[PDB]
C-alpha cells in the first residue's frame, strides 16, 4: 500500500493516483519542506507563507501560489520527479532510486547500491503536496 518509485505513472509529468492511499498532512509537509535532510525545498525556493525560515534560496521562484498554478496531480509529479515536467531541471527528484551516475550512500561519499532509498518516502511526498495545494492567492 505504496506505489513504489519505479511503478509511478507520469502523464505529462502528472501523477493522478496517491502514492500511499492516505491523505497528506500539510503541517508535516511544512516540516519536510524546511528540514535540510528531507525536502530542503527552501535551499532553492522562498516560501513567503513561512516567514520564520531563514536564508531561503533564490535558485527558483517562490512557492507561494503553486496551489493555483498546478493541480494536486501535477504537484505530486513535480515533487516525486520534477524532471518529468521540466526536462533537465536542476530540481532533484525526491522519489527516484536509480539511473544515477556514481550513486552514493547518503553523504558518505561511498558507493550506494541501486536501488537507493528515495530522498523522501511516499507519505512524505503526499504530505508536501497537501501543503502545496494550500498555497493559493
Amino acid at each position: 500500500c505504496e506505489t513504489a518509485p519505479k511503478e509511478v505513472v507520469y502523464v505529462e509529468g502528472a501523477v493522478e493516483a496517491s502514492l500511499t492511499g492516505a491523505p497528506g498532512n500539510p503541517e508535516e509537509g511544512v516540516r519536510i519542506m524546511t528540514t535540510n535532510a528531507l525536502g530542503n525545498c527552501v535551499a532553492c525556493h522562498q516560501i513567503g507563507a513561512l516567514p520564520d525560515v531563514e536564508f531561503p534560496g533564490t535558485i527558483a521562484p517562490p512557492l507561494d501560489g503553486a496551489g493555483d498554478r498546478w493541480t494536486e496531480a501535477q504537484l505530486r509529479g513535480i515533487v516525486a520527479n520534477a524532471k518529468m515536467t521540466f526536462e533537465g531541471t536542476f530540481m532533484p527528484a525526491f522519489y527516484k532510486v536509480d539511473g544515477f551516475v556514481r550513486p552514493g550512500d547518503g553523504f558518505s561519499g561511498k558507493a550506494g547500491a541501486e536501488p537507493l532509498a528515495p530522498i523522501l518516502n511516499a507519505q512524505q511526498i503526499e504530505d508536501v503536496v497537501a501543503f502545496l495545494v494550500t498555497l493559493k492567492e
Binding site: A43, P56, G57, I59, F90, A93, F100, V101, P103, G104
Partner: protein
C-alpha cells in the same frame, strides 16, 4: 550577484594588485560575459580578510610552510632549501599549474611535484595530499606567483587531460543529479540557502576556510563537492581529479593568482 569592489593587498613589500574580474578565456566566451574570483561573492568582512597580509589568517600557514621549507627533515638532513635555496625559486609555477611536465610528459598537480622531491630526494614516505605538511607547502609555493595571471595551457599534450576534466565538470553526479556547472555556471550569483554561489574558481587556492579554521586544497574541495550531490566521490589526487583541477584552473585563466585566499 557579484559585488562591485577591487582587491589590492597590503604586504611587506608594497601593494599587490589582484585581478578579480576579467574577460573569460576564449573557450568560455559564450558562457560568461565575465569571470570573477570567489572573493567577489563574499561579504565585506570576509573580503577584508584578504586585503592585507597582517589580517589574512592563511599567512600563518604560509610562514609555517617556510619553516618546513628550511627544515632538515630528510633522512640525511636534506631540506627544500638545500637544493632550491629561497622559495622564490618557485616563482611563476603556481600560475601555470596544473601542467604536463616538460621532461616526463606526466600531468602534475602541485602535490605531485612536492611528493616527487619528498620521496625521491629526501628519502621520506610520501606526504598525505591533504596533510598539514602538504597544505602549508602549497601555500608557500602559491605565494611565489601572487599577482601573476593564471595561465594554464589547455592545448597540445594537455588537451586530452583537459577534455577528461571538462566531461567531469558537466557530469550530473549522485542521487541529486548535479554537476559543477549546474551550481557554478547556471546559478552563479544566486543564493543556495545561506551560500552565495560563485563561479567555483580555484585561482585563490590554497584557501583558508573560516568554517574550518584551516587551509584547504582544490583537491579536497572537489572531494566534498561531488560527495554532496549524494554520490560516490573521487580520491584527492586521483587521475580524474588531477584532470578536473587542470580544467577548472583554466576556467579562471586571466584572473590573478591570489596566493592564499580567504573564504567561508
Amino acid at each position: 550577484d557579484p559585488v562591485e569592489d577591487g582587491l589590492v593587498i597590503e604586504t611587506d613589500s608594497g601593494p599587490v594588485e589582484i585581478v578579480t574580474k576579467t574577460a573569460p578565456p576564449a573557450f568560455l566566451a559564450d558562457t560568461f560575459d565575465t569571470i570573477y574570483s570567489g572573493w567577489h561573492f563574499r561579504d565585506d568582512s570576509t573580503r577584508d580578510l584578504e586585503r592585507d597580509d597582517f589580517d589574512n589568517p592563511a599567512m600563518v600557514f604560509v610562514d609555517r610552510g617556510l619553516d618546513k621549507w628550511n627544515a632538515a627533515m630528510g633522512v640525511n638532513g636534506e631540506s627544500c632549501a638545500s637544493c632550491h635555496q629561497g622559495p622564490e625559486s618557485m616563482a611563476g609555477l603556481r600560475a601555470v599549474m596544473p601542467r604536463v611536465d616538460e621532461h616526463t610528459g606526466k600531468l602534475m598537480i602541485m602535490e605531485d611535484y612536492v611528493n616527487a622531491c619528498v620521496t625521491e630526494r629526501m628519502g621520506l614516505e610520501k606526504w598525505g595530499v591533504t596533510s598539514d605538511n602538504m597544505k602549508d607547502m602549497l601555500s608557500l609555493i602559491s605565494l611565489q606567483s601572487r599577482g601573476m595571471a593564471v595561465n594554464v595551457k589547455i592545448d597540445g599534450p594537455a588537451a586530452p587531460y583537459w577534455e577528461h576534466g571538462k566531461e567531469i565538470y558537466y557530469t550530473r553526479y549522485g542521487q541529486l543529479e548535479m554537476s559543477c556547472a549546474n551550481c557554478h555556471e547556471d546559478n552563479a550569483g544566486n543564493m543556495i540557502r545561506a551560500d552565495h554561489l560563485s563561479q567555483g574558481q580555484i585561482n585563490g587556492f590554497p584557501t583558508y576556510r573560516l568554517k574550518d579554521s584551516g587551509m584547504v586544497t582544490a583537491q579536497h574541495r572537489f572531494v566534498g563537492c561531488v560527495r554532496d550531490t549524494r554520490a560516490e566521490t573521487f580520491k584527492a589526487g586521483s587521475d580524474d581529479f588531477k584532470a578536473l583541477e587542470l580544467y577548472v584552473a583554466s576556467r579562471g585563466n586571466g584572473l590573478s593568482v591570489e596566493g592564499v585566499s580567504v573564504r567561508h
